[PDB]
Every structure is written in C-alpha cells, then in structure tokens.
Amino acid sequence: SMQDPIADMLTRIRNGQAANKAAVTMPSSKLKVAIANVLKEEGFIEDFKVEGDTKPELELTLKYFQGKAVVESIQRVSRPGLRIYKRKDELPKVMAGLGIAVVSTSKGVMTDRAARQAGLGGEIICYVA
Amino acid sequence: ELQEKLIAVNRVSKTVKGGRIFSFTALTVVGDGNGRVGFGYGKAREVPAAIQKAMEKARRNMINVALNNGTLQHPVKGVHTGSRVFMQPASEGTGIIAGGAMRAVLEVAGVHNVLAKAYGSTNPINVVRATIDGLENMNSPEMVAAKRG
Amino acid sequence: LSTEATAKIVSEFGRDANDTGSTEVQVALLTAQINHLQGHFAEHKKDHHSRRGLLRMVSQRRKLLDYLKRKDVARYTRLIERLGLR
Amino acid sequence: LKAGVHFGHQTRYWNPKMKPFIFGARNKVHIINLEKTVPMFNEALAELNKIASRKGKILFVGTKRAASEAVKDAALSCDQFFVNHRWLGGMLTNWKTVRQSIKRLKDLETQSQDGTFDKLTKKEALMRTRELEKLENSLGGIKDMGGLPDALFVIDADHEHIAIKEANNLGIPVFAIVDTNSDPDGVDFVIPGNDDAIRAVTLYLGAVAATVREGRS
RNA sequence: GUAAAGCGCACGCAGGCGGUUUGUUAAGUCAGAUGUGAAAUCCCCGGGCUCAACCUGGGAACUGCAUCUGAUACUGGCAAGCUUGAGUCUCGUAGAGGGGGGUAGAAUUCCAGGAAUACCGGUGGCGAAGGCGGCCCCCUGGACGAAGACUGACGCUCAGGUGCGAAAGCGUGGGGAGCAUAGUCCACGCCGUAAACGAUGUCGACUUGGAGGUUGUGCCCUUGAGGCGUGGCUUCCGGAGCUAACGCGUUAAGUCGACCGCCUGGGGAGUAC
C-alpha cells in the first residue's frame, strides 16, 4: 500500500471472494499477522502461513463453502483521517450482532466480546460479516 | 394454499401505421404465509385477462426465504436497478411500517413486524424486485453458525 | 554535463566509494548541474519548453535540503558552506 | 481409463471460466486429464440408477451431427428416450404444449394404423406426407413418453447451450459432458470429457446404457 | 462518460495524509473513580384534583467539560534502524520534444522570391496541453531497457500563487506574391480567449479475459522471416461486477484508500452595479 496498509489489504482479500481462488497473498507487516489471526479463529477463513524475512509475507487460505463464499460483507470503517474512537457502550454490533466487530483494543485485535469480557473499546478496525 | 395481491395497472400504448393500440400491465406477487414468496408479470389487451396470466407466473419461481418470528432479524439493505430499500428488524406487534410494493411481499411471506423505508425512486415496478433480493440475501442463525463452523 | 565532469565531482563528496545517492553527494552534483545549465539559459531566452525541466530540479534542490535540515543540522550547514547557498 | 484413445481437440481460442478442469496446454492445445473426471465417470453411476429407480426418463439431447446414430446406440433398447436431431424450444419447460402438438399428431396416426389414409384425394394427400416426413423427426423419443423427463442429459455444451440455458432454468439434474471452452456454471453435475471425436462419444453413451435396464430395478 | 457539474495545462508555499522494525513517552483515544453539569420541562415506577389536562415524591438522563489512577494494540512527538515507495550514478535504445543558426528543392505568381511539403505519412511517433513535420550540425527536454550499486520515507496531493498560454484584435517597426485594402509574416509589447470535448482530477494497490499496435531486450539447433517469456505505453471486441439505459470493462466508469476542482429547476444571465 501507499496510504493505508490495512484498507488496501481489504481490497485484496474479497477480490478472492469474487473469483474463488484458493490462496491469497499480501506483503505482511507485523500488524498484518495480527489481522488474520482473528479471521481464522472466528472461522471466516481457514489457514495462513507467514513466509519471507526480507519480504515478510502471508499465504492465506480462503474459505468458500459452495458457489457461495463464506466472508460475505466485510467493510473497513475507520479509514485514516476519519478515526471513530468508540466508547465501549456504543459498540457496533455487526448485523444485529450476528457477525464480529474487529476493534483495536489495548489487549489485542481479537474482538467479538470486548463488550463484556475485556471491557475496553478503541478504534474500530473493520466490521466483518 | 397461496395468497395473491395486485400492485397496479398502467395505460400502456403502442403505435402502428393505423393508430394507437393500447394494452394493460399487471404486477402481482404470490407467497404462502410461511416464508416462500414469488412474483410475476403479465400483459393483455384488456384488464382482467392480464391478471389471470400473470398470476401463474408467480405460482412458479417462488424463492426459499426463512423467517424468524414473523419478522426479520438482521438489517439487510436491498437494492435492485432503480431503488434502495432499507429494512431494519423491529419489535413484535409493530406493523409493517412500509411504503408501496414491499407491503405486498411482506404480508405474503409471514413477515408482520418490520419497519422499513424506500430510499430513492418510488416506481413500483422496480421496487418489488429489490425487496425479494433483500429477503434472498438474508441468513438465519443456523445459516450463521453452520456456515462458519 | 552528465558523464565526464560528473566523474570528477563524484568522489569529492562521498564518505566512501560508491555511496552515490547519499544526500550530500546528491545535491552537490545537482546544484552544480543547475549553474552550468543556467549558462544555457543565460541565452536562448525563448525555450519555455525546457525551462520547466530546470524549474523541476531547482525545487527538488530545496526538497532534499529539507532532508538535511530535519535530520542533521550540522551536515546541512557543512555543504552550504562548501556551496555558498541561499 | 480408456482415455489413452481420447485426449484432445478444440484448439487454442478458449474461455478462462474453464480454469480447474484443464490439466495444461501442450503445443497450442490443452489436454483433458483423468484425475478430476475418472471420479465423475462413476460418481455419475452413483446417481444414474437411483434416479432410474424412480422409473426415470432421460432425454438424450443430442443435436450434434456425429451423434445421429451415436446417441441412439443403446438408448431405447435400454428403454430410455433420445432426440438425435433438431430441438424444440422448451422440451422440458414448454413440454406440456408440445403434448398439444402431439394432439395434432396421434389422431392423424389413425390414418396410418388404419387404412383410412385413402380419404382426401391424392392431390390433397400430396402435401399431407410433408408433416409425416417431419413430425416424426423431432418427436422421436416423446411418443412413448407420458410424463416430464425425470432426469436430463445434454451430451455437448457448445451446440445446445441454448438448451442448457433452458435446462438449468427449471432445476433438473444434468449429466453433461462439457468442453474445454464452455460456460460451465449452469450444469451443477459437470464432466469435462471429450465431447468431440465420434469414436469417443460412443464410449460414454454405451458405458451408461449397460446398467440402466437394472436402474429401474 | 452524455441528465445542472473535472479549472485548457503544469510545478508547487502555508494546509490534509504515511513504507518498514525496535525502544520510549502517554498528548489522541479506551478504562476507573472523584469533582461538577442550577431547580423547573423531556423520560420511567409512585402519589393528589370524582378521571384527563394540570400539580407533584424519588430515580434515570443532562450525551458536557477539568483532575488523579490505569492501559499500551492503533495513532501521535523524541531516539535508533532495515529494503519495496521514491531518488542519483553507470550503460545503451528509439523518437514532428523544443531554441538559435544558416540551408534549400519533388514544387510555385510578378519583373525578383515570397511560401512550405510531394514522397515517407500511418491505426505510426514525440510532448504537461495549446501543439509540433525538408535536410545537417549547435546548446538543451522528457521517457525507455538490460544489469549492479548505494540513500533509508526523503513522498502523494492542493486553496490562494506563479509561469507556459489556438485564433484574432491592438500597440509600436517593415513587407506585400500564394492571395485574404491595412492586417495575415517575422519581431518586440498588450491581450488570456475557445468543442483549450478522453463532454472521463491524481497517485497507489487489487480483480475473467481474448485478438492486433509499437518499442525493446533473456532463454531456446537464435539454426530464420521465427517460439516461450519478459518490460513499457496505445488500439479492438468482450466475463464477473456495475450503470437510468446507452453502456464501461486490466489505459475504467468495476472493488477501494488520501487529497483537490465543481453542481443543487428553467428563463432574466455571463447581464445590472
């Protein structure tokens, strides 16, 4: 990317959700390992392998259950220059809470249940559905 | 059984070498009150024969849509080719606070508790296409959980 | 211009061999190649086409001087001593 | 399997919707492999007989030229249906009024099964043989039919994709054989076998027909 | 993109916006309380007028600002780095990019010379646009390719701002054929105008494609006019997706991100002051 590494990643993934390729790959900062170690665990994709040490870079495995593809409607919201630092008792539940809401907390990125369990919100990263 | 409903009827003309031959259109939907809905379209040269042919158009091609509590549960946005439809799930006992064409498709699904809005164009041919796409895109909590894990 | 007199001015500024694009070596090569090109615009005085190509690198001459300014105030003054700038 | 015989046709100009099923190009043409298709040469037979045990009807939609005899080889001797010639628009979705176009026919069959064709003196009976040439052309395996086709079988997906476009429209399973340069995403039970080369088109139709008599069980 | 709407085009100042790793601070933000947000209205359980309006007890809420304590994932200032964004060097390659200088005919009126290409000349090709075509040298402009090398974010964008600005007109100084009687033509000054219409800001990254253009250059009996790549830009039809259609469609208008210009019914009107 030039001027957001995480926004321009989220174009790269769901273009794989429009031709149903197997593996996708983007140049991977240490933040970017902490991105898809949430999407795997909540079940939206399957497996990933970092590789490279002068170009640290990922091998994400997609997940399309049918002709239907699992990662339906992912959206970045906090785009740079429009930071929305949510207080935690405003929190965006995604699609009546049926999805997950990736929030950049202190204690990590892994965020469904920061509403009650962790107990501190922050900058939204992206809605996920 | 099923349940019909009209939408409208126009004053569709035509032009031949002689004069102005008219026609009539007939927009209907069909849905049994349990979740499956369908629609059709049919013309004629008079009024009542148009309905008769368009009513069978909807008695096939009824699409499978699941409901939750006589209502929707999660806010899909529906758009089809001229118009935007914004359906928010709401409480029980709320009526279908809705505009034109989607009233006909919601009181045939079994849907009875939705507040919703038509956002842009108000042309009832293209409105009734969108909300059927709006209910097509939805997912029940079974479709949530069984697909992700 | 590009090959001959640049080859005698390259090692006049390098902290070692082949450090060519370092910012000290950069501007002193470049500012030299604005004086000599201004001999070409000492006359001809109607080449409004090429004059922006001069106007291109005169602004970039001030651009990399900011990179000396924001990093090392010492090395900034050292080459504008050796070039007599501003 | 037997596909040392049949491997390739259909030169370089291609559709890139057929990415997985192609093994790889070899001298300005691609090779049809075995690894993704030898399963579907007998995954199909897991679905032939159980559909046939519903007292089935399998329309061999075969409007190619090489499949003139090559699709009626063991088709109706195994008691199934076939059309090895021209195609009516909607032989499923418009079939009920094709039966109306047999309501024209089987009362005029009474002229043939009886000797009552002598009526309507022979200047009239000059032109009356011209339907009798042509009504029994496209209506071959449909006079013995009494119902909707209980399955569907298009043999090739580049000639009768007009038919497939109407076949996928109303939801009947299709045991197709698609080509290397197709629009394959209509037939949801798909085989990229060699659907050219008249020697090879017998090698699937006779391969199915050895079992479908036992398919009805 | 055609419905009102992308300045004619360029670098850029103040503005807005960050590749990549570690340290660190705690302003941005999250958390916790403690202050404080006058009472009355709004809101929820409860009282009183024969009910209701209305009067009313307590709560919640007043989305706020200031302070201590905490948190280090994002972001931000300080410190330290690494190679892909960018950029300099080497090295070749192709070319109506210009400026000056003279040159001079495949051609062409008068009694001398004003003009500027016939051919190549085209779907070529240059350039930021208006644009620019005889020939050779002179000072200069940009891009491209093949490798190496090192710089370590040094960048992208733009209100004003300043330049370059088709014709004519006008100024001052001449000419007079091709042919419009100055003017057209060179030139020094004003003038900034237009279908200055890809009626398509800019850069970046991603996604089914197919055939031709042209510039290279690696491998391969180069054994060749030639294949597979592999660069760059420009055509021609077309998937998904999109669009009111018509259509766009790896040079986007498709999925996005940062930033700038502009429009909000027609006439009066690009007019009044």
Query: Helix, strand, coil: what percent of chain B each, to 5?
Result: 25, 25, 50
Q: Which domains does chain A have, with CATH numbers?
A: 1-71 (3.30.1370.30), 72-129 (3.30.1490.10)
Number of domains in chain B: 2
Instruction: List the structure tokens of A68.
Output: 């239907």
Phi, psi at residue A19, to the nearest 5°? Answer: -135, -5
Q: How far is A54 from chain B (nearest CA, A)?
A: 34
Contact indicator for B97, B115 with CB cutoff of 8 Å? yes
Residue B147, Cβ neighbours under 10 Å: how many? 16
CATH number of D88-139: 1.10.287.610
Instruction: Pick the closest to residue B66 from B74, B55, B56 (CA basis).
Output: B74
- CATH code, B48: 3.30.160.20
CATH number of D20-87+151-217: 3.40.50.10490
The span from the CA of A126 to the CA of A76, in Å, is: 4
What domain range includes position B92? Answer: 64-148
Instruction: List the structure tokens of B99.
Output: 């505009």
List of chain B residues whose C-beta atoms are within 8 Å of the C-beta of residue A68: 147
Domain identity same for B138 and B83 = yes
| Boundary of a domain, candidates B63, B98, B114 | B63
Distances (CA, A) of D118 to D104, D113, D123, D126: 19, 12, 11, 12
The phi-psi region of residue D10 (left if phi > 0; otherwise alpha if psi is between -120 and 50; otherwise beta) is left
Instruction: List the structure tokens of D152.
Output: 């569907």
Instruction: List the structure tokens of D158.
Output: 């580049």
The span from the CA of A71 to the CA of D146, in Å, is: 46
Residues 6+ apart with CB under 8 A from D2: D203
* Domain ranges across chain D: 20-87+151-217, 88-139
The phi-psi region of residue D114 (left if phi > 0; otherwise alpha if psi is between -120 and 50; otherwise beta) is beta
- CATH code, B77: 3.30.230.10
List of chain A residues whose C-beta atoms are within 8 Å of the C-beta of residue B148: 42-44, 70
Domain identity same for B53 and B77 = no
Domain identity same for B84 and B120 = yes
Task: Say which DSSP state A113 is in.
Answer: G
The span from the CA of D48 to the CA of D52, in Å, is: 6
* Domain ranges across chain C: 1-86
Structural resolution in Å:
3.8
Residue B74, Cβ neighbours under 10 Å: how many? 21
Helices (H), chain D: 45-52, 95-103, 110-113, 122-127, 129-138, 161-167, 198-208
List all residues of chain A from 94 to 113 with a beta carbon under 8 Å from chain B.
95-96, 98
Contact indicator for A84, A124 with CB cutoff of 8 Å? yes
Contact indicator for A123, A83 with CB cutoff of 8 Å? yes
Task: Using the structure, give the distance in angstroms from the CA atom of B82 to the C1' atom of E5, rounded to a whole number.
Answer: 22
The phi-psi region of residue A119 (left if phi > 0; otherwise alpha if psi is between -120 and 50; otherwise beta) is left
Helices (H), B62-123: 101-106
Amino acid at A128: V
Contact indicator for B118, B83 with CB cutoff of 8 Å? yes
Long-range contacts of the stretch D129-135 (C-beta < 8 A, 24+): D135/D104, D135/D105
Phi, psi at residue D153, to the nearest 5°? Answer: -145, 95
Task: Using the structure, give the distance in angstroms from the CA atom of C40 to the C1' atom of E105, rounded to a whole number.
Answer: 34
Nearest-by-Cβ selection for B74 from A65, A68, A98: A98
Is it the case that chain A and chain B have 3 or more CB pairs lying under 8 Å apart? Answer: yes
Domain identity same for B142 and B119 = yes
